[PDB]
């Protein structure tokens, strides 16, 4: 007799608690919490662990989600600065890092973020030797390359959020113009998560109907190219208006964790090793259409690129090697 | 003082209950309940009304869903043989009708189902003058034509479930072979909901990549045509094994009610008036890619059909006119 | 022939777009977007309208949600400073207003927020004469009183978010201690959304088992009273750590919009007219357990309060009248 | 070069597919598919395996769900008569067995179902040594006892669906009368899943308000006892109208699998070992309020039963021992 002793009986038998679908969101900032509320809301994990160097912020964000437990189906929300909190995660999502000030390219953030990465990746792997690492930080393509190097994980367990967002942005504008739910519109953005992103004009379709063979001049005149245009600009506009981007990437990331936690084998433009494809010579990471499952990237989809697109992918891959080349370890 | 008087107070103010997103599923059979449990589960309507001539069956099915209210977010489930139960529905889904015995074509059901239709459509319209009618009964293409004629509703408020299912079936097999979630696979089935269904080989794609320009011989050799093959066969197999088809169409229908109840403007292969498209001369109904909203079909998507497909659509449209022609009113 | 003309056909028939389940979130701040992302995610409305005086912030938040359309089932997201944007809303959620600086009581915000209210309520009612107004702003109890007065709407269409959050907070701590999902724990917080909130010790239960008759001393010794304690403190902690509260109220609000948009008739502690209950003499608003539907508060639940609780409710109602009394119109 | 070779590339790295949240529904009948469509729809497992002795029926049901993959988030649906198909399930739900003909008590099914059980339990455990077994078959209380004996699994990994349904049925009728969503109504049914079920009159509440102290005579006069009445009758009515019960138990079961697959620790009336509680002397299984997690029953909730209820539980436990006693192994 205590309250709990008087209410709660026990059977002869029982075993230690254990969570089997754990996800760790590293970084409890704008993007941080956006990914975290998305996942919570999609009941993707039975456990969510937040990690951040900022200790007050972490605990308040933790607390704030915990007060909402009644309204969820995620049995455990934990948090701490010590990476021990993240042990046995199936997915580790990284969000730590400086962000773009307005007008600053994502590429300008490489040194700042490499330096954070160099501290975070050892501990991650330390505590979850078999996880899948999902980088979101910018410059996301370069950072997925770093994370892979520093980590030594099989290439397939390292993914960048990459162009999933870009392609989402593209298909929303397509939708806006054709007057069709973005989900019914099919168009792909690959290459860098940034200013040198390639738009696959010859893949664009609504119900398998090629926009290119209907228009022809698509790749160029009628300001259809503006769609690509608004796509590269979009991060910059949102930043100047709002200050940062949060909610689109939370969703874009949750989409990705779903395919993974459900072993769904869906095609998503994310960041991978592009070496040996389309004549690329180096260890460069960029988005291509990838098949994802519960163990990472299952397969890459080989795109039959037109001459100009293929030329665009080449450039993309180039602006990024000139950056990796000079990465000091 | 009564139980309720002692517990439940009242404010000075209040107004009559009223439901604003009502859906009536007419027919409480296999397909009946499949559509009904799908919708319930997607919280699409604030009210669900079932109607059937079979009075014991209706009330038990009603009862059975009602006992599950705690586990739902649909405030009202009602039922009755008198079409008064369905008044002010935003969507009316018809499921009443004989079904295929094994080996029987859907076309063989026309007389049986016309005769039911002739009793059901007047009352429907009677009680919900502004609804959207969704036919599911077979032969679904012919029945959406009947329903339209007998009803006199603006063509856009009359839809057949049509090829939404067929195309779902197609993309599942595509998925099975490429090793990609059916949702990432894009392929379209149009024409009749049946044996003369046209498969658009030149629309087939994964990430905007045309399977046709990669293969070429697609429309013919390598048994890729078998996919189309298994698609026409599928209803017949399921029937001989199981006796009928239920769960695939429930889902296919819910998908459709969603786009409608959410005014989402998504593209779905459903049955419409094909007159004046692809050289079709008559008042024939078949599936084409349609844009749907909260008021019905918003727009048709004009497909750039290849010579053989276009020839297939023509045949389809023909096997069906020879049937409508002879419909006695 | 244009792109769209070549792709998109038309039937003989069609009708004007119109949305039928519209919700307007007034205020695109922390709480603002939390309520807005919750609702979006629960597919509660076919249309979401944001309104704010801050024009850059509004448009960027609008834009940011729009870029996420593919990942939702809400056909329309709109925004503007002119209340015309909100016309024909079924629900209007108000979030505009100063917020607590750390250590500041919610009561200190009355003058600031009355002054905003005096500008916002006329236009709301102007544009949606039949809506349901949901106040969230603080001090929420006083503001639902203002909104009602200035508006002249039937008392039942005016609701405060009130103690739904408080009671959520209570049941999370209960859960934490008994070792039971907060949803399986039943405990109620009523009275002011603030420091004088009454906790109904004699309603507390897990599976209809009264914690009070098991403990007895519950209302006082064993620090069970600390639960109430942490509940009043909670807003203040989160504020000092994080700066404001957002995510718990977004969820708490969505829960409320659900019951409404689904005509579910669920019991929620929200703010109403308490006049004539428990000896209250004045036009005071506080949370009591209310039945909600698609037209507002359907019914109040009469609580059989114990002598001390009833005494607590009285005090609560008193600290709030001393404040309404002096409201200058 | 093959289709797939031309489209699908490979990284240097990759690992064997594996599913980590597997559920096996044994029995592809009415109840069978109801549980299976519920779970599918709640994205509870990354893999669903159906097992049945009836081979045509199994494969067609399998096929029928597979054709609906596009419309789900469950990567794998499998099926087979050989229990090898079920290896490494986290949850095994048993549905195999005769069902009640109208007017037949659940108790009459014991011999028929024991005999099936004796074949099924060895293979289950054979193939998934660490699973959680969920019995649904009738008489469910007796069958969870059998399953435990024959299996030798730690008592906590064996659960009966039990009174979760009964209590759902109770709270729907409560709701019907008070005019409150069944979820806001709290009332508990324990004891046998059948004719001797005990209703806890003294636990009944809406917002922690005791219906008993408001009424007093509750346990007896005013036909409030009819609610209990309709609860025991309900299975029998549905059977005579419809032929069997399916959809309520599918949902009731999914609710249960959720708490389990999400390690939510929620309280559910299910079947357990009641030995040593309320003076029960024997190895009897009946529903009591239990805390469930990812490893089974975590804890029992000790109810403070009134004298008559406690007397009811005793009887219940007795009608069931007289049946177990004589079970021939
Ligand atoms: N790839 C995409 O689509 C995309 C989209 C938007 C934003 N981003 C990027 O996301 C990152 C975060 O953006 P933000 O707006 O949330 O920034 P922000 O100001 O919120 O900073 C994020 C956080 O990272 C933390 N952090 C710093 N060093 C840390 C360390 N050693 N360990 C753990 N956490 C640490 C900070 O304490 C803070 O919580 C930036 O790199 C930004 O460029 C990427
Ligand atoms: N288009 C599709 O994709 C598709 C898929 C499968 C099944 N179907 C069709 O669905 C229809 C029903 O199939 P089923 O398997 O459920 O058949 P079924 O045996 O269950 O018959 C359906 C029901 O319709 C009722 N009905 C008969 N006349 C009625 C009337 N006047 N008013 C109301 N209800 C009445 C019956 O009482 C019964 O409840 C059949 O036409 C079948 O061919 C269509
Ligand atoms: N009741 C609850 O549970 C609860 C919980 C938390 C916060 N709140 C309250 O929510 C309100 C907003 O809190 P916050 O943290 O989001 O504050 P905040 O700083 O974000 O301010 C909210 C916004 O209101 C806008 N606003 C100001 N005047 C306006 C006008 N005339 N028309 C429209 N919008 C106008 C501002 O531009 C800003 O967008 C505060 O009153 C806070 O106390 C209530
Ligand atoms: N506990 C509850 O709440 C509850 C509710 C309703 C129904 N039930 C029970 O569910 C059980 C099934 O009911 P039903 O209506 O679906 O019956 P049913 O006719 O559909 O029979 C179910 C199935 O079990 C299969 N089966 C028989 N022996 C088998 C074996 N050795 N291995 C595997 N499968 C085998 C049959 O082939 C068939 O697929 C019955 O015991 C019924 O009483 C329980």
Within this chain, do residues C107 and C49 fall inside the same structural domain, yes or no?
yes
- The beta strand positions in chain A, using DSSP E, are 8-9, 22-26, 47-51, 76-79, 91-94, 132-135, 158-160, 186-189, 199-206, 209-210, 266-273, 285-293, 296-301
Q: Which of C156, C193, C228, C268 is catalytic?
A: C193
Tokens of D254: 């999914």
Q: Which of B318, B264, B329 is nearest to B291 (CA)?
A: B264
Q: Which of A7, C184, A10 is nearest to D156 (CA)?
A: A10
**3-class SS at D186?**
strand
Within this chain, do residues B111 and B167 fall inside the same structural domain, yes or no?
no
Q: What is the DSSP string of A262-285?
A: TT--EEEEEEEE-TTSTT--S--E
**Residue having the nearest C-alpha atom to atom 15 of ligand 1:** A30
Within this chain, do residues A149 and A223 fall inside the same structural domain, yes or no?
no
Residue with tokens 């100063």: C98
- CA gap B18, A324 in Å, rounded: 63
Give the end of a domain, one of B137, B162, B187: B162
Q: Which of C97, C28, C89, C35 is nearest to C63 (CA)?
A: C28
Contact C323, C107 (CB under 8 A): yes
Contact B239, B210 (CB under 8 A): no
C207·D301 Cβ contact <8 A: yes
Counting the structural domains of chain D, the total is: 2
Chain C CA closest to residue D210: C203
Within this chain, do residues C110 and C192 fall inside the same structural domain, yes or no?
no
Residue B195 marked as a ligand binder? no
Contact C254, A37 (CB under 8 A): no
Contacts of D176 (CB under 8 A, 6+ apart): none
- On chain B, the residues whose CB falls within 8 A of the CB of D181 are 69-70, 75
Structural domain span for residue A232: 163-329
Contact B23, B257 (CB under 8 A): yes
- Judge if the beta carbon of residue B140 lies within 6 A of ligand 2: yes
Q: Which of C144, C125, C142 is nearest to C134 (CA)?
A: C144
Q: What is the DSSP string of C165-206?
A: THHHHHHHHHHHHHTS-GGG-EEEE-B-SSTTPPEEEEEEEE
End-to-end CA distance of chain B: 61
- CA gap C293, C35 in Å, rounded: 19
- Exposed, middle or buried: residue C57 (CB in 10 Å: 0-12, 13-18, 19+)? middle
Residue with tokens 């500008």: C119
- Judge if the beta carbon of residue C236 lies within 6 A of ligand 3: no
Contact B67, D169 (CB under 8 A): yes
Contacts of D175 (CB under 8 A, 6+ apart): B69, B70, D181, D182, D184, D185
Give the end of a domain, one of A162, A177, A200: A162
Chain B CA closest to residue D74: B181
Within this chain, do residues D53 and D168 fall inside the same structural domain, yes or no?
no
- CA gap C13, C34 in Å, rounded: 40
Within this chain, do residues C100 and C82 fall inside the same structural domain, yes or no?
yes
Give the end of a domain, one of B103, B137, B162: B162
Q: Which of A290, A84, A308, A61 is nearest to A201 (CA)?
A: A308
- Tell me the ligand closest to C238's alpha carbon: 3
- Experimental technique behind these coordinates: X-ray
- Whole-angstrom CA distances from D232 to A76, B56, D35, D171, D180 are 37, 20, 22, 13, 22
The neighbours of chain A, by the rule of 3 or more Cβ pairs under 8 Å, are B, C, D
B17·C76 Cβ contact <8 A: no
The neighbours of chain D, by the rule of 3 or more Cβ pairs under 8 Å, are A, B, C
Q: What is the DSSP string of C87-123?
A: TT-SEEEE--S--PPTT--GGGGHHHHHHHHHHHHHH
- CA gap D212, D218 in Å, rounded: 6
End-to-end CA distance of chain A: 61
How many helical (H) and strand (E) elements, i.e. helices and strands, does chain C have? Answer: 10, 13
End-to-end CA distance of chain C: 61
CA atoms in the 13 A half-sphere facing the CB of C268 = 26
Within this chain, do residues B208 and B152 fall inside the same structural domain, yes or no?
no
Interface of C with D (CB under 8 A): 179-181, 183-184, 186-188, 200, 202-210, 213-214, 259, 264-267, 269, 289, 291, 298-299, 301, 303-304
- CA gap B312, B317 in Å, rounded: 9
Q: How many CB atoms lie within 10 A of CB D76?
A: 18
D78 to chain C, closest Cα gap in Å? 29
The helix or strand, by DSSP H or E, that contains position B23, with its residue range, turns out to be: strand B22-26
Within this chain, do residues C199 and C309 fall inside the same structural domain, yes or no?
yes
Cα-to-centroid distance, D31 and ligand 4 (Å): 7
Contact B124, B150 (CB under 8 A): no
B281 to chain A, closest Cα gap in Å? 24
Residue A36 marked as a ligand binder? yes
Tokens of A157: 């367990």
Active site residues of A: 193
Tokens of A72: 């969820």
Tokens of B117: 């239709």
Contact C21, C44 (CB under 8 A): yes
Q: How many CB atoms lie within 10 A of CB C34?
A: 26
Contacts of D102 (CB under 8 A, 6+ apart): D236, D239, D240
A34 to chain C, closest Cα gap in Å? 10
- CA gap A35, A29 in Å, rounded: 10
Among B79, B97, B144, B159, which residue has the most ligand 2 atoms within 8 Å of its CB, making it the best to mutate?
A: B97
Q: Is the preceding peptide bond at C139 cis, omega within 30 degrees of 0? A: yes
A56 to chain D, closest Cα gap in Å? 27
Chain A CA closest to residue B202: A208
- CA gap B76, B17 in Å, rounded: 11
Contacts of C104 (CB under 8 A, 6+ apart): none
Among C28, C31, C103, which residue has the most ligand 3 atoms within 8 Å of its CB, making it the best to mutate?
A: C31
CATH of the domain at B85: 3.40.50.720
Cα-to-centroid distance, B256 and ligand 2 (Å): 18
- Tell me the ligand closest to A123's alpha carbon: 1
D214·B7 Cβ contact <8 A: yes
Q: What is the DSSP string of B127-190?
A: H-TT-EEEE-SSSHHHHHHHHHHHH---GGGEEE-GGGTHHHHHHHHHHHHHTS-GGG-EEEE-
Q: Which residues of D are annotated as a binding site for NAD(+)?
A: 29-57, 99, 138
Q: Which long-range contacts (CB under 8 A, 24 or more apart) does A99-106 make?
A: A99/A29, A99/A30, A99/A31, A99/A138, A99/A244, A100/A138, A100/A235, A100/A236, A100/A239, A100/A244, A102/A236, A102/A239, A102/A240, A103/A236, A103/A240, A105/A194, A105/A195, A106/A138, A106/A139, A106/A140, A106/A193, A106/A194, A106/A235
The number of residues making up chain C comes to 329
- CA gap A266, A291 in Å, rounded: 5
**Cα B319 → chain centroid:** 21
Residue B82 marked as a ligand binder? no
Tokens of A149: 């190097």
Within this chain, do residues A327 and A178 fall inside the same structural domain, yes or no?
yes
The helix or strand, by DSSP H or E, that contains position C299, with its residue range, turns out to be: strand C296-301
C304·D210 Cβ contact <8 A: yes
Q: CA-based angle A97:A57:C168, to the nearest 5? A: 130
Tokens of C133: 């107004």
End-to-end CA distance of chain D: 61
| Pocket of ligand 4 from Cβ distances under 6 Å | D 26-32, 52-54, 95-97, 99-100, 109, 113, 116, 119-120, 136-138, 140, 161, 165, 193, 244-245, 249
Q: Which of D292, D320, D309, D307 is nearest to D190 (CA)?
A: D309
**Residue having the nearest C-alpha atom to atom 15 of ligand 3:** C30
Within this chain, do residues D153 and D172 fall inside the same structural domain, yes or no?
no
Within this chain, do residues D214 and D288 fall inside the same structural domain, yes or no?
yes
- Judge if the beta carbon of residue A164 lies within 6 A of ligand 1: no
CATH of the domain at C278: 3.90.110.10
**Alpha helical stretches, state H, D22-83:** 30-41, 55-66
Residue A133 marked as a ligand binder? no
The neighbours of chain C, by the rule of 3 or more Cβ pairs under 8 Å, are A, B, D
Contact D197, D190 (CB under 8 A): yes
Cα-to-centroid distance, A85 and ligand 1 (Å): 19
Three-class secondary structure assignment of D3-20:
HHHHHEECCCCCCCCCCC
- Whole-angstrom CA distances from B210 to A164, A208, B227, C32 are 20, 8, 17, 44
**Residue having the nearest C-alpha atom to atom 5 of ligand 4:** D249
Contact A228, B319 (CB under 8 A): no
Data resolution in angstroms: 2.1
Within this chain, do residues A116 and A180 fall inside the same structural domain, yes or no?
no
Q: Locate the ligand 3 atom nearest the alpha carbon of residue C57 and give its number.
A: 39
């Amino acid at each position: 007799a205590t309250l709990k002793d008087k209410l709660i009986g026990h059977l002869a038998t029982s075993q230690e608690p254990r969570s089997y679908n754990k996800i760790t969101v590293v970084g409890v900032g704008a993007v941080g919490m956006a990914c975290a509320i998305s996942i919570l809301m999609k009941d993707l994990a039975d456990e969510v662990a937040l990690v951040d160097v900022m200790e007050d912020k972490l605990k308040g964000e933790m607390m704030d989600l915990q007060h909402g437990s009644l309204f969820l189906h995620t049995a455990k929300i934990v948090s701490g600065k010590d990476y021990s909190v993240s042990a046995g995660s199936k997915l580790v999502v990284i969000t730590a890092g400086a962000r773009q000030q307005e007008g600053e390219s994502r590429l300008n953030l490489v040194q700042r973020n490499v330096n954070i990465f160099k501290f975070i990746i050892p501990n991650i792997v330390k505590h979850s030797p078999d996880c899948i690492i999902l980088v979101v930080s910018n410059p996301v393509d370069v950072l997925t390359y770093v994370a892979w190097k520093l980590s030594g994980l099989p290439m397939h367990r390292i993914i960048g959020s990459g162009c999933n967002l870009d392609s989402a942005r593209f298909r929303y504008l397509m939708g806006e113009r054709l007057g069709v739910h973005s989900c019914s519109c099919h168009g792909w953005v690959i290459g860098e998560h940034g200013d040198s992103v390639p738009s696959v004009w010859s893949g664009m379709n609504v119900a398998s109907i090629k926009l290119h063979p209907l228009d022809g001049t698509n790749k160029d005149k009628q300001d259809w190219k503006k769609l690509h245009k608004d796509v590269v600009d979009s991060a910059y506009e949102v930043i100047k208006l709002k200050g940062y981007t949060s909610w689109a990437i939370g969703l874009s990331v949750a989409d990705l964790a779903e395919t993974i936690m459900k072993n769904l084998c869906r095609v998503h433009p994310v960041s991978t090793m592009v070496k040996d494809f389309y004549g690329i010579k180096d260890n460069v990471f960029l988005s291509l259409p990838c098949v994802l499952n519960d163990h990472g990237i299952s397969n890459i989809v080989k795109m039959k690129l037109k001459p100009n697109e293929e030329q665009q992918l080449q450039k993309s891959a180039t602006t990024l090697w000139d950056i990796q080349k000079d990465l000091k370890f």
